[PDB]
């Protein structure tokens, strides 16, 4: 199936003293494999998945050097942006950046990304054609004009379509035992009497990967959204994910309700029903 590689960067200014707090993380699909925290002792890009530990010294040296360069750019940006928005030097602000590439089911470049945010809102983003920019306001417009003149889009395009895809393919092969394996959700249902006449049926989906999944409730073969509750997909902590959906029903009529589970790891959707 399709796969992706993404890098997330966050820098928070600390006006009271010192430089911004900078944190960077790298992911392949829903698996984190590297990180950098300016607050940590190593001051180096660090591994977070076993399959990336195969890389030699030159890899870690280059990645460390580059992530530090990323850090400084963000430090400068915080200053530049404080001026663009005419803000005080006494408050703390945030800049975020995210970029990456996707390969399709054919394993060929599918698409690339490069977006930026200031204080949690879109600032500037590269469009899908990887040739134009989307600026959210006049501060971003100034940046856009400068990046057009410096041809930053062309440079990012060469990375996203080349280096990015090539490395994503390399990581996929090296960590194939996990990255190219889908973990079908382990499902079951629980029954909870909320009163003498009503009961809650909760449909569980556990230990699945990737995170993408859909849980739906039907009553007498027809989708039901009322009297239901769906929680946000959450990380188990061991690399897999969890989710559940519940419905309140009249005691004694549990048999009319079915929970439908769709996930890439299942040849066909599963259907659960209570006793």
């Amino acid at each position: 199936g399709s796969h992706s590689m993404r890098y997330f960067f966050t820098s928070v200014s600390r006006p009271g003293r010192g430089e911004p707090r900078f944190i960077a993380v790298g992911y392949v699909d829903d698996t984190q494999f590297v990180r950098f925290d300016s607050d940590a002792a190593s001051q180096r890009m660090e591994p977070r998945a076993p399959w990336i530990e195969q890389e030699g010294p030159e890899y870690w040296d280059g990645e460390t050097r580059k992530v530090k360069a990323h850090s400084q750019t963000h430090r400068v940006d915080l200053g530049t942006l404080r001026g663009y928005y005419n803000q005080s030097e006494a408050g703390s602000h945030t800049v975020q950046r995210m970029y990456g590439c996707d390969v399709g089911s054919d394993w060929r470049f599918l698409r690339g990304y490069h977006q930026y945010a200031y204080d949690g809102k879109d600032y500037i983003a590269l469009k899908e054609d990887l040739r134009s920019w989307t600026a959210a306001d006049m501060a971003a417009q100034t940046t856009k004009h400068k990046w057009e003149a410096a041809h930053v889009a062309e440079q990012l395009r060469a990375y996203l379509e080349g280096t990015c895809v090539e490395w994503l393919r390399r990581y996929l092969e090296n960590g194939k035992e996990t990255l190219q394996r889908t973990d079908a959700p382990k499902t079951h249902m629980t029954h909870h009497a909320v009163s003498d006449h009503e009961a809650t049926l909760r449909c569980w989906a556990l230990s699945f990967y990737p995170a993408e999944i859909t849980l739906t409730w039907q009553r007498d073969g027809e989708d039901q959204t009322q009297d239901t509750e769906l929680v946000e997909t959450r990380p188990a902590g061991d690399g897999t994910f969890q989710k559940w959906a519940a419905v309140v029903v009249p005691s004694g009529q549990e048999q009319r309700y079915t929970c439908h589970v769709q996930h890439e790891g299942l040849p066909k959707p599963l259907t659960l029903r209570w006793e």
């Binding site: 890098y7 790298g26 890899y59 280059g62 990645e63 580059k66 992530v67 360069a69 990323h70 750019t73 400068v76 940006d77 530049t80 942006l81 800049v95 970029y99 930026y116 600032y123 500037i124 940046t143 990046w147 410096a150 930053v152 440079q155 990012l156 990375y159 280096t163 990015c164 490395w167």
Partner: peptide, 9 residues
């Protein structure tokens, strides 16, 4: 692998 160049805003 990370990009090699990062232009300022």
């Amino acid at each position: 692998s990370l990009a090699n160049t990062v232009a300022t805003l």
